[model samples]
Structures are given as structure tokens and as C-alpha cells.
Target chain A: GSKPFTVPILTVEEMTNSRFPIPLEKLFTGPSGAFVVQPQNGRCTTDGVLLGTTQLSPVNICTFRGDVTHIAGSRNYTMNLASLNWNNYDPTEEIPAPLGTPDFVGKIQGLLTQTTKGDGSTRGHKATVYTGSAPFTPKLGSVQFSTDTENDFETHQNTKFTPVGVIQDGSTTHRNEPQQWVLPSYSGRNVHNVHLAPAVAPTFPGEQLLFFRSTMPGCSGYPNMDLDCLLPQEWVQHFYQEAAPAQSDVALLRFVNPDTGRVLFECKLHKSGYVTVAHTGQHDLVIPPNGYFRFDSWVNQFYTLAPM
Target chain B: GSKPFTVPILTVEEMTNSRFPIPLEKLFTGPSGAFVVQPQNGRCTTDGVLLGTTQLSPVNICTFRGDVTHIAGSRNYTMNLASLNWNNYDPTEEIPAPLGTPDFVGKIQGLLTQTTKGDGSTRGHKATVYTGSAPFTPKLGSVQFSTDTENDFETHQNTKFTPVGVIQDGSTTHRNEPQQWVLPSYSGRNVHNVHLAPAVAPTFPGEQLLFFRSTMPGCSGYPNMDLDCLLPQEWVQHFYQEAAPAQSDVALLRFVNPDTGRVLFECKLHKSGYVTVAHTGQHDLVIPPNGYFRFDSWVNQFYTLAPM
Candidate 1:
């Protein structure tokens, strides 16, 4: 049923030290000098394309949103670039005399590239071009968003909170579906109410409801209170049409208990967002080669998921 | 400017057959196995915890949402990873294979072993745990949820469309910056929108709204129509509480023209929902390893973005 076979003998030392002089062959001790060749039909072979080497620095990993199918084809899900331990690395098969040092502090870049569907374009097919993967996170750092002089909310000048809302319209109560889809993950759940307001103002008696989710910590693994307002196909486009000066728009969200329809938290400033909880939409976009684009973060804050 | 070297004088065929045999490394020929270890030590070395490796089937890819720390550190810039094409792979010489028959694939399963805060359960300091990487899309095929006969909405039993408006607690008018953050890969361009609504039956009009980039036919870049929402920090938590039990509840959504706030499309059912579009709340409970989580066919169906 399974192919069973054993092969060569490689000392861990040999493999680790092989980085320097970057060995050409797995068996060879030192880097194999550059070799050149020509294509007969003008078609590039694996070697012809020079897939092995890199003019760009080696990236250990990266995090990206959108459709993986966009820039990567045949390679999606199948690719996993191994990370090297910069702490203790070597260049030669010999030990005791370390050939090179690990960065331990250097950043590992991403291998995948991103592109956007140009302005006024709907499908991902119209994306601009392919660039590289995003910024690097520390080797053992928190996946939290930090404030800088450029992006920190405290420093932003023209920041304002123009919240958004949606009206329901559909044959089936399907509208309730997105009501259950909120961040952390998209799941149409026990969405009993999608209450917006009942004679409210900038300061309502309870809270300004954006999305709702009903939760019971006793039965499920998440919080007892859930959120609603996971946009449906029609609603996603509605925001696009309603948004003015449409390059970008912002929404202040307040998750109220779906059962009680009460607010749990409110926002005073916009920079107080958290990490993206989940994706509730459909189908990943298929991007082309050499295409690059940006994505909007669900919750822009920086935090990790832990047991409540 | 660059380094160069050459391999020993050996024919291409001879090099391909030079790998040795036995008690050492096991070699897999095709693209899938060419670069990966069959049974990986799913231990995260960073925290020395047990992190599992994602298994990719013959025609499938494992996907995962990664943490921001794994990609960008403090700086929010782009990252990248590259692979070399070592044609005419020879086991004996150990030249890393190129793109084809003997080429190596960029599968970085090791990232799964990159460790995080010790599983938090005091589960001992295990090495292998499931984490995220920039390029490694977590393959959830192994984690698919099991379902029964009726494809009924599991969490929410009686979902209805009850679009709430200006509640007494607070006005829908946003006050500060909301959760929406722009993606860097797309050049600080906002890539998505999230909407909220009620799950009342016989859905009412003016209750559902969608948010996404407008790529409608002839629009120019930059001066794109942008929607802004004003929200206070206190209201942000009312709708979404990550640690709640009602997480299974879901909602449906739709968005129309911003000019008229007309309905554009509808997103009611989920993939597992018995209604039509399928609905499942299990995904809502899954805390993604990365800062975000991409959903099933989410980008295409419900969520709308530019470059249509």
C-alpha cells in the first residue's frame, strides 16, 4: 500500500553547515559555483528559470489574506518553506569551528506575493501586479499590532467614526445567516435578534449595535454572548454603493448580546480595533502571476486567542 | 556582484541516479514528497510545544490563518521567501531538486512546529502545536467537522429578520476609528467590509447592508467612494465578545448602492446551512492561528471588494 524505502546517510552536522558556500549537491561539501545554460526552444526549464537560487533574501514565513489561488497556482497548500535555526548554524561539515551565525534577531520574510484587483475592478482577475509577501514578525514575538508615529491612532489627525448599518431584504430569512457570521470565524449560528436601535442618539441607553451573536459559554467553547451582522452577498455590495468618496470606508462595531440585544462594548476611537477574527464571505479569489494587492483587516488590533 | 561556482564533471543522468541506499534519509520523488518529511515532529521549537504539521492530500491543500507576529515584526512591510531549482537532482550528490521530476517544492511544514505560548492549558511544554506562517495555508481538511442527516442550522433555531435602528443606548453614529484596517500588500488599500443585521423572520427592509471595495465598471482609483462609521469604544464590545457561548449563531446580509443604499446582492445561507447557501457555526468557534481566518468561498459570494 505504501512505498517503503530507505536511502542515504547524512549527519545533521553536514546539513546544518551546508548553508555557507551553499552546497550545490546534497552530498557535496561546499557551494557549487554558478552554472549557465541556454534554452533550445526558448522555453525555460527548472534550471533555466534559476528556481533554486535567490537574489532576494530568504524569507522564513509570511501571513497573507485574500485568495491563495491568486499568485500561487499548483503550489498553494503544497508549499511549506522550512525555517532555519539562526541560533546555531554552520557552513562546513566540520564541527567546533562554526562557519556562520544565525540571525536569531533577523526577520524572516514571506515567500508568497500579493496583488489587488485595480480600482473600479470587481473580480480579483483585474488585480494590479505581483509583489512579495508582507512584513515580518519576530521569531518569537506576539502577533499584536503596535502603534507607530504613522499609524497610531493618537497621531492620526483626520480620524472620525462614521458608523455604518444594513437593512434586510431577501425572500428566505437568509438575512439571519450573516447575522451569525462575525469575526474569529464565520458561522451562521443562533442569531435571534439584529437590533439596531429604538429611539437612540450618539449616546443610547444601552449601546449602538453593529453585529449580534448569541452565545452560551456553558455549551460552546466561545463566549456566552455572540455577534451578528456577517454580511451577505447583497449587503457587501451595499456598503460599496453607500460609501461616499469610495476609496475606503470605516465602521464602528459594537457587539450586543443577541438574546438580550444589549451592547457589550463600545468604541471611543478607531485605532482600538483587534486582530481579524475570521472570514465569512465565499470563495477565495484567484490572482494571477506578478500581481500584488492589499487587504482590509477585520479587527486591526493586535492580540491572540486564549481560553476565557 | 554575485557568487558563482560549478559542480564536478558528471553527466545529468549519472547525477540523477547517484543517491545511496538504506538506514539514512528516505527519498520521495514527486513534487509533494520531494521536499517534505512524511511524519513530521509536530513540535514547535520556539516554545517547545507539540504543533502538528498539515497534511496535503494528492489533490488538496491545507489552509490556515496565521498570526501577525509570524509575518511582520514591529514594522509593517512586505516579506518574501524564494526557492532554487536544482535540475538533474542526484541523491548521491544531494543537490536540491529544481522545479520538476527532481525539483524541490517549497513546503514549509516546519513552521507548524514553530511554537507559541505553551498551549496555555499548562499542557506541559509540548513542542508541536498548530500555528501559522506567511506562506503556509493551514489545511483544515483533517479538521473538517462531522455532520448528521438533516442539514439544519445547528446553533440558531429560530432566526428572524429584526433590523434595529437608533437604539436608546447610543446612536449608530460612529465616534472613533473602527476595526477596519487597510492591507499593506494592496498598497494601504482597504480590501473588505463587515455588516450587521437582525435575524427576524419575514426580514424587514432597511435592515441588511454589506461592505466591500467598489470595482463597478468605470471608476477611477484613489478618489474612490469611501464610507465612514462613527463608533464609541463602549459600543464595540456589545456586538462581538470573543469569549461568548452563543458563538454558533450566524446572520445573513446584503448591500445595495451607496448612492441610494440599494441592495446589490444577498448572502443568506452558509455552506452547511440547510436553507441554500449552506450554514455552519463551527467555523465561528475556531480561533485562527494567525491574526485572521479566511472562510470557504467567502471572497466570492458574500463579501464584495474592488477589481470585480
Candidate 2:
């Protein structure tokens, strides 16, 4: 018995590259087919940098409760990425807490299954890294989990949440004693001309920074796939007392293609305002996406806590 | 020769009481309708005063102007109100500068001159206050004046200005140090009821303490008519800080209609939120309004300053 599933929907009209919304009346009417703008000359425009990126594989769903099993003699067992770290930098110190790419998270949320799977497919997700806009363009990146932890899968067996990875981008980004962390400089395992090793990973003192796997509640049916990104349960922030001086809440997510080092989404979330408080005292400022799917756009599903 | 004039149009719809446009869509149907509601609360709902009322008055356009004919109407019209004695109080052991209502000191800019015969025949356009409901009702109470003798109308009669006023409603009260100058407590002719005196009447030092008038340009055109009120000029505050903990901008306007003895407005303006930097933090404080005016219904036609 197969459970029913529904596809998550998003409107292209809602996305933008700049933190400004291009009204529907002016869609495809300017540079990048957008033109609605606000006064940004003053301390108005916010900085939402492309934070971090990750990738995941396709998943299968099931009907009856049981451990999903691959078909007999299938190219079955493969190392699925649980989580990884990144040492990214944000040029604009103005962007306090940056959440770059969430579509990948949405995709993973769209993929994970709840019930049983029929088999004949990999049953996990991955977050990879890369550089540049197009996949073939080279930067450097890596997959979170590289080892085939078959027994480890049992640890997350039927579990609800799992921590994925720590993705951050911004200058003096973290307020809680930032200098203590480092980015992964390791490089190797070029799966293709595009996908290389991830350069950095998030490592907090005494925190393993674990990536846990769980089913996206919506993907409880057959032909399951991690297609949509999931918003995180809690928003994260990086504060600088002098410049930022104020506290802000934020969450960061990344979307990447492992086979081809291509980042699908990169953006940030902020209180709605063309000008952030750093200058105009515009708190709770929310600058909508400027280009289609380029800025911080609200996702359709609730972000479940990733279990470590 | 009759000087040419341009009647500044008054749009009743643009004068609502609300600080901002109300959230609902229906209220904005037409002109001369409900501009915006003035909440019974204390102040404007600005971000700075979200926790408390800090309502500010709408910027009024001075439609007409007039001269302060003679400073004789009020004796408190000294180059320095500090000469007044504040001997009544021993609270802070310091003299407070006299906080007087702004006086009419200039010419009305837009009032069309009408030569009416003594027989009560209409020869010119009579002035009337028009109420509006489009922008938002204005919070009004007292008006302020410039303390600079050079800016004084008696001294500098020809200059014009772009002076603006601040209105007070339930939330628009003012506070200031009443100069410790020796002012006669004459109930029949106190400073508070200064306006009751006819224009051009002689004034005494004690008289000055009780009366206040505005001398903005074209002020005489709207004799006995009302305009938006202003706060105590900033210079007045400078005089008291060294003398006492100058009562921060105090509401000097005692809006009691002599005919009915009905008090329209009166209150002391205070910091809205808890004193984070002070020892005692006030919270959940509510000050009820003695009376409120539906300002959106009032009409204004001009905006002019006394000194150019």
C-alpha cells in the first residue's frame, strides 16, 4: 500500500536577487526582467550573502512500516551525506545572520519518507559544495558524509529529527565569540570535473555538529524525492556589538548539486525594510526577493528540527 | 490696492487623527469622511513609543498670517522668560524658566482680505475651520515659539519662516519648567487665560506669565480661530537645565473654553517606556485623557513661517 503525497508549490514571481520585491505589474520589465525598487542610497539596503551550500540524493517512500530495503543485486549500498561544515565569509558586515540557500533544504524536506519503502533505490540525502554559478565552473566543495554507514542508518531509523550541517556567511558573522571556529580547507575526491571536496565544515567547541536524517512528513508516499527546501525550526544570528550593535534572529540553509557543483539558491532573511536598523532604525525590516528564486523566499513546509 | 492672493486648498481627507493609515481598506472611501481614529491611548504608536503613547501632532500648514500688533498684550514677552521667579516650589531648589504658550507674531499668508461694512454685510471671504478625514486626524493642543529676539515679530516684522507646530491629543501633552519669576496669581487675568484679553491690550510682567499668543505671519486673519499647537521652543529648555531638572517639554496649553469652562486638553508628557538607565522603571502605565478632539474634521488652508 502506497501513501498519498502532494507536491510543494512556489511562485517564480516571489523570488528576486536583490532584497527588493519587483511588483507583478512590472515583472520581466527591467534588468533580469524586474524593476520595482526602493530608496537604497541611505542605510536602507541589507546584505544577505550567499551563505553555505549542500546537496542530497533522491529517496524512496513506502506504505507499511518497515526498514526500506533495496532491490536484490541493485547498486544499493552507498555513503549518504549526513552533515558537513563550511568556513565561508561575508563581505558585508551589515548582514548579521545570513541564510544563503534553503531550496536544498526544501528539496531534502520534499524527499525524506515517513512510512516504508518498496526498495531498488538509495534511501538517504547528501549536501555537497562547489564554487561558481554554473556547475562546470570550479570553486571547491565536498559532501557532508562520505562513508557508507549502513549500521549508522539504523541510529536514525524512524527518528523524527537529525541535524544536517552548519551553514554561515557574513563578516564578524557570529556574535557569541566567533573567532573560535574554522572552515574545512581539506580538498580531494573530485567526483567529476565540477564536484570537489568541501573546503570547510562548522565545528563548535564540544559540539560534534552532527547531521541527522529524517523523513519529510509530506514524502510518505511512493516516488518520494527531496525536492523542496525546509526552513529550520530556530533562526540563527551572528552579531557584532559595535556595527550590528543590535540582535537579530536568522536561519541559514543551502542548496547544491553534488554531481555538478552548482548552487541553486543563496540568500538571507531579515525584518522587512529597505533599510536595516544599523542605519535607519528600520527594525523588523523585510526586503523581499528581487530576482526569481534568488533571495530569501518563504518555503512551503515547516522546518523540522534535525536530530543529531 | 488689494494685494493678489492664492487660496491654499484644504483637503479634509488628508487630516486624520491616526499617526499612520489604519490597516483596514474600507475607511478610505471619500473626502470629509473618517480620516483615522485617535485611540484613547496616551501617545502616538511610533516604534519609539510602542510600549507607551508618544503620539505626535500632524505638521500643520499655516493658511494665514498676522502680526503680534504689539507685545503690550503680554508682559511675559521679555527677551528672557528666566527673569520670572519660581519661588512657589522648594522641590528642586532651582528656578524653572517660564513655559509660556506660543504667541501669534506674524502675518497671515493666505487669508483673502474682505472689506466688510459695519452693517454686518459680507465684503470678503470669512475664515472657517474645515474638517478633513483623508490623511489622518492631527493631534493638537499647544504651540511653541522661537525664543530668539531676532526672530521676535515686534523686533523683526518683515521676515518669514517655515516654522511647524506639534499637536497634542490625549497622547500629545507637553511638560516644562514654569519660570520661577514673580507672576501675579490673578485669577481674573492669569497667564493661563491670556488669550481672553483682546489683541493689542497692554501686558505686565505678571501678565506675561498668564498670557501667550502666536505671531506667525497672517495670524490676525484667523483671529479667535485655532491653529495647530507647537512645543516649547528648544531654547527655553536650555535655560532651565542649569537651574533645575527642567521639566522636559511641558504642555502649556490649558484648552478650557471660557464660555463653558470645559477643559479640552491638559496633561504632562513623560518618557513612554521604562527607564532602562534609571533606578526606577515604570511599566504598564496608563494616563487617561480628560478630553479629545476629532481633529480630522478640522480644516486648514495655509502653511507659513514668520521669519524668512
Candidate 3:
């Protein structure tokens, strides 16, 4: 059976090439998109308002307005939470008759699935973020990378929402958080992303959409931060060690496309700031003493063991 | 069935209370062991050789030579890997009728079992370590907590070992590492600690020993540290986030007893130096992008939810 699938709102640090790498060619819109294997800067829309994923301050989610494209230009905008109709659009479901993008937006589908490398340890169901504002575009959904190389960034910030939110509220952030009432109830657990399985063909019968397992970052479904900090499982070990020699000082981390096992980006640092990652990876539902997952995110994807 | 179990040689920082907490009450030997709760310095054998678990420099494992005891005295000893039969001697199996402590030494057994709090997230199969030498004895195995008030610290360093190491080659460090071929093949994956389940009475028909699931640190089965560094999943998220405010600067970490979910020791720090933790807690066998476990260790054990 088809499963619950979604894509994460990539962050600046996560999107910057080589961090958590996505197949650049596949994410490029239109027919010749797959050939875009080489690095230009980053993904973007037709109009090129710069995906804004690389921005590093007052951290926010990187999003898209129209279908994504592989345009060659640059654009910028006032970055804020209230900027688009992204407030509650599921992007995976139908938006009724006249208002939404129907199956694509409300349903939140995948871009496409690709086999990943490594032992599947560096990956997690968390958001991949970037560090500074790079003049680029947003990461795309396979559908979003559809038959169009249309417009880029959007400028519709909201005045805010009321009650459960009035869809037409002028201010975006001022509205109700996206209420994903149609999908299956989240068991409040980490749903496995079948995409990360080493041999993808055996798990599913058809081509699958790549997705973030959790709800969109700012939309909803995220548990409230308990005024406490948590280390993403990926980097927990590196952070625990002390008296680190010069080599141990900074962490060599990666941002990867879970489906393809593509390390979208890799960097070295002592720590990384938190970002809303998708369900494909995140903290485990079971935390016992001496608990641990085999594949942690912060580990460099250098070593890989084949499946038995 | 009673499985092959072993205990971790505790570290200084890990034993200094609350880091990776072991039950203080249960660990005390002698008649009034459980009632010996309130904090003292640290655990030690009967001789009060000051369990050297609290040292900061040249990190080493905290161990015991003779049986452990809950005495109220202070003692000191040299800190080095060259110090005891700890180099080999499996406390689980019998050391042949004539030579060793037999069942307790060759085949390590557990101390005892205790229940813990939380959703089982704050724990992992990693060893908890401590910093600096404290004027104490050492953490003990429930079996080692037998009917004797034996001696404490031993002063035999090694002249080094030859071949697979001659058993009583005089120098402790000068011997072969403990070899345990009597057990099942290690899947090289983290084994589930069935004891962590809330209802423990059912796991084994009898009282269970508190044990470290992995081979004792510095023992065997530990994959060598690759040229690259990896993070303990418990603290991965914290290390990833940046622009961290005052609260996030340092981690409020805990050292938990995997069997009982006891927060043996807790503290707040940005990063900790590397130490030898057992299989009950260590890096995972799998490493993939965006991978994560829910209950990371560094997280405060404050918000625990009950099990179903």
C-alpha cells in the first residue's frame, strides 16, 4: 500500500550544496532537469527570487510559491514568517473547488525517489537547514518540479489569522496553523520512510515521491519545545566527547537526501543549530537508557557497510 | 533465559552522580546496602582506595579489584590502563575451578535490576563516564557485592603483554584483552535491553542483575574510532543548533543506568570528552542521513511520560 510521505522545508545550512545533498539534476524543473548534476549555486523557481534557504539569521523555513525550476538568475525578498499562503496548505491534499492546488498542495507529495549511499546511518527524520542567505530558490517536490519553469518567490505576507484561521486572512503568519485533518492520524511516533531502504525496488512496486515524514516545519504537528535543548541524534556523539584534539574540535557533518542517500551537503563544525526536520528522520520514539540508533546524522558518510 | 551479561567499568564523570546514573541505593553492598542512599563521595571496595572515577586528565575507566563495598572512607591510587586484572578476567564465566573467581570472573553477571522513569528516550546503549579522580572506591557488580568486605585498590601495573597475553604475566596492563567467545555472535548491532521495558519481572523469572549491555569499555567488540568523529545520538540535536541562547550554550546531560533507567549522573556542559562506554550505550551500527532517536541522553529526564 502507498504510505504517508512528505518533504522537509530545507534550511539554509542544510540546502547549501554538499551539506544534505539532494540530486541536483532531479530537483531541477522541466525535461532536461536530470542532467543538472553539477553544482551552480542552489535550486530556485523560474522567476529566481532566490530560494532563500541559505539564509542564516532569525531562522525560518524555506518554501516555494509556484512549481520549481532550474532558472539561472537571482532575486531577494523580505524574509519573515508571514510571507506566503504556506500557512495551512497541505500541498498533499485537494483544496476543495476554487481555492487550493488540490492533490499536490494539500496532499504533499514527493519529488521522486532516489537510492542513497552509506549504511543509512547519517540520515534522520529531521529538517536540513542552511547558514546564510544565498541568492537561490527553494527545494522542490517532484510534482513541484513539474512541467513548468514558472515564477519564483511569492510576496503575500499575512496580517494574521483568527480563531482556527480564516483562509483569506491578508497576513499569513497571523492565521491558524495548518490543520492536517484529512490524513491518517499521526500516532505521534516516527513513521519509517521506506525510501531510505538500501534496495528500494524490493520495498515498493512503483516510483515513489521523496518526502519529509513529519508535518511541515511551521505548519503544525511539531511538538512544542519544552524550553529545553535536544541534540539531533546525528551529532550527539561528537558533542559528548571532550578534550577533543584539534581534529575532534569541529564535526564533519552531512545533510542528505534520504531517498537517494545523496549527501546534499557536508560541513565541519562543533555544533549545528536546530531546524524542523521531517519525519523521515528525527529523535526516536523509544528513548531508553543506553539507547541509540545505528545511523546517527552527524557522522560523516565516509564509511558504509553493505546490507547482508 | 538468563543471557550473557557484563558490567561496564564506570568512569569518573559517569559515577559522580546523575550523569549516567546507577542506583546508589542498590549498589551498596553489605547488610544495609539499599539504605545507604544519601550521597557520599563515590563507590569503592572495602579498602576505601578512593574509587578513582572522578579524574579529569588522561581519562581512564573506574574499576574494582576486590569485591565492592559501601564504606565511608577515602583512598587514592595511580591512574593508568596498566592497573588490574580488569585487563582480562570476564566476571561472567567461571575462571576454571582452580584459577579464578570462576562464574563471576570469566562470565560477567549483573548486579541487580531496578525500574526507571520516563518514556525510555533519555537512554542509549552507551557507557556513561566521569571526570577527575575522586577519593572513593568503585561501582560494583551485584555478584561482586557478595558476602565479603574485601580489599580495595591493587597496585600491579604491566611490563606489557606478549602474544595473546599470558594470563598472570605479573603486570595487569601487560596482558591480553578479555576474550569472550562463549556467547552468541554479536550482530555488531545494538542489542535490545529487554530489561528496559517497564514490567521487568516478566523478562526473566528471577531477580535480574543490573548490567551494562555492551562489552565493557576498553574490552572488545568496540569498532575502532575511525579517522572521523561521530556524535552520540543523545546529544546530536543540541550540538546541531546554533544562535543558541544562554540555556542552550551548555547541555544539561545525564548518565543513565540502562537497565533501571536511572539517571546515574547529570550535568550541564557543551561538549564532553570521549570515554569508553559499553554496548548498552554507544554509536549505532547504522549511519544514515537524517537518522535520529527520540530520547537523547543529554536531555533532562524531567518530562517523563508513562508507558502504555
| Per-model DockQ against the true two-chain complex | 0.02, 0.00, 0.01
Model 3 spans with C-alpha error above 4 angstroms: A1-230, A233-238, A245-251, A255-308, B1-26, B29-308
Q: Is candidate 1 or candidate 2 better by lDDT?
A: 2
Alpha carbon lDDT at A143, candidate 2: 20
TM-score of chain A for candidate 2?
0.19
lDDT per residue for candidate 3 within B256-282, as digits (tens), equals 554565554333222221112112222
Q: Return the lDDT, model 3, position A226.
A: 17
Cα displacement (Å) at residue B30, model 2: 49
lDDT of 3 by residue, A152-188 (tens): 3222322111000001112323222222211111111
TM-score of 1: 0.16
Residue A233 in candidate 1, Cα distance off native in Å: 17
Error of 2 at A104 (Å): 39
Whole-model lDDT values for every prediction: 0.17, 0.19, 0.19
Instruction: Give the range of the ten consecutive residues with the poorest summed lDDT in model 1 chain B.
Output: B18-27
Off by over 4 Å in 2: A1-33, A40-246, A249-272, A275-308, B1-55, B61-103, B108-308
TM-score of each: 0.16, 0.16, 0.17
